Design a protein around this ligand. Structure first.
Ligand SMILES: CCCCCCCCCCCCCC(=O)O[C@H](COC(=O)CCCCCCCCCC[C@@H](C)CCCCCCCCCCCC(=O)O[C@H](COC(=O)CCCCCCCCCC)COP(=O)(O)OCC[N+](C)(C)C)COP(=O)(O)OCC[N+](C)(C)C
Ligand code: EGY
Ligand code: EGY
Ligand code: MG
Lengths: 138, 78
């Protein structure tokens, strides 16, 4: 599986390969980021958060979103397939939804009122947006 | 002499040869399957040589031992 032995190399068939590699990388990164955000929000916002670990998680999520944006720009400019419009839309929507959910969780865990039904609705909306993103991400 | 020598009992109780043959094969076979799957799905830009070496070595070891115990289980007693 290391010997090519090919004479006429088709770049059209290699473009598809260098697209598949990238989309696998991006799917892994996005799934891992969603899992990390959910795990941090569930393990740091039970009853006391103090907006310190939540701030570190938000910084890590912003760095992950920046790396994903760089990879999306790379796959848009370099490769032949578009892989940008849907990718950029999903990345912006997911970043905004993650920031809004983190802000709602950090406000509900550090206020007089304890939001349980609101937190359940926020988690359900996050899961619905994630399902739509997984249907859009193929 | 011959009086101060112990009887030579086998190192592995023969009744344990069948139990040891299936398990060692199964695990082995499993890993083997994994390797082959990995070689068909992964493209050129998504192949790690260390992961392949590791999984292949584990499969080879477990499979060698399982094959030995099976070959000895049928009664060849190599
Ligand atoms: C079901 C679960 C089984 C669990 C297994 C446990 C093992 C137990 C051992 C058996 C116990 C026996 C009991 C016994 O011995 O009783 C004795 C009596 O003695 C006897 O007489 C009996 C002796 C019998 C011993 C026989 C042992 C033999 C065991 C061999 C094992 C088996 C199970 C499996 C064999 C695998 C066969 C391989 C098949 C090849 C597959 C072909 C691949 C097809 C293909 O090309 O697909 C392609 C994809 O390509 C690939 O990647 C495939 C590569 C695969 C290569 C190998 C991988 C195999 C892994 C499988 C897991 C598809 O092509 P496409 O992709 O579509 O092409 C398109 C390409 N393009 C165009 C690019 C798209 C008791 O007697 P007793 O009285 O006790 O005697 C003892 C007396 N004393 C002597 C002791 C005195
Ligand atoms: C009994 C001995 C007979 C000796 C035969 C002498 C051969 C003369 C050498 C001429 C040069 C051959 C060119 C050649 O090798 O082409 C090989 C495919 O190869 C062939 O098409 C025919 C070559 C047959 C030679 C077999 C010897 C192989 C020994 C390797 C260890 C690949 O062709 P490609 O067109 O690149 O196939 C790739 C197809 N893709 C879609 C995947 C891209
Ligand atoms: C006394 C006991 C003796 C024990 C004998 C041991 C038998 C050893 C078995 C050898 C196994 C052959 C290995 C083999 O099948 O090669 C396969 C290619 O796979 C195929 O395409 C079909 C080949 C299937 C043939 C299997 C029959 C082997 C029977 C031997 C007894 C590799 O194909 P790949 O390289 O993975 O093709 C993928 C290419 N991509 C670019 C898409 C990744
Ligand atoms: Mg011997």
């Amino acid at each position: 599986v290391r010997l090519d032995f090919s004479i006429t190399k088709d770049p059209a068939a290699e473009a598809r390969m260098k697209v598949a590699c990238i989309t696998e990388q991006v799917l892994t990164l996005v799934n891992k980021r969603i899992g990390l955000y959910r795990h941090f929000d569930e393990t740091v916002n039970r009853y006391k958060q103090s907006r310190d670990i939540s701030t570190l998680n938000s910084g890590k999520k912003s760095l992950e979103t920046e790396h994903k944006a760089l990879t999306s720009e790379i796959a848009l400019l370099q490769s032949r397939l578009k892989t940008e419009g849907s990718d950029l839309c999903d990345r912006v929507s997911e970043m905004q939804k993650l920031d809004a959910q983190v802000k709602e969780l950090v406000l509900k865990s550090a206020v007089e009122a304890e939001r349980l039904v609101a937190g359940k609705l926020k988690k359900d909306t996050y899961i619905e947006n994630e399902k739509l993103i997984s249907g859009k991400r193929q | 002499e011959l009086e101060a020598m112990s009887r030579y009992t086998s190192p592995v109780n023969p009744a344990v040869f069948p139990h040891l043959t299936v398990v060692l094969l199964a695990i082995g076979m499993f890993f083997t399957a994994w390797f082959f799957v990995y070689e068909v799905t992964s493209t050129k830009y998504t192949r790690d040589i260390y992961k392949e070496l590791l999984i292949s070595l584990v499969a080879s070891l477990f499979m060698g031992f399982g094959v030995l115990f099976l070959l000895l289980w049928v009664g060849i007693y190599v």
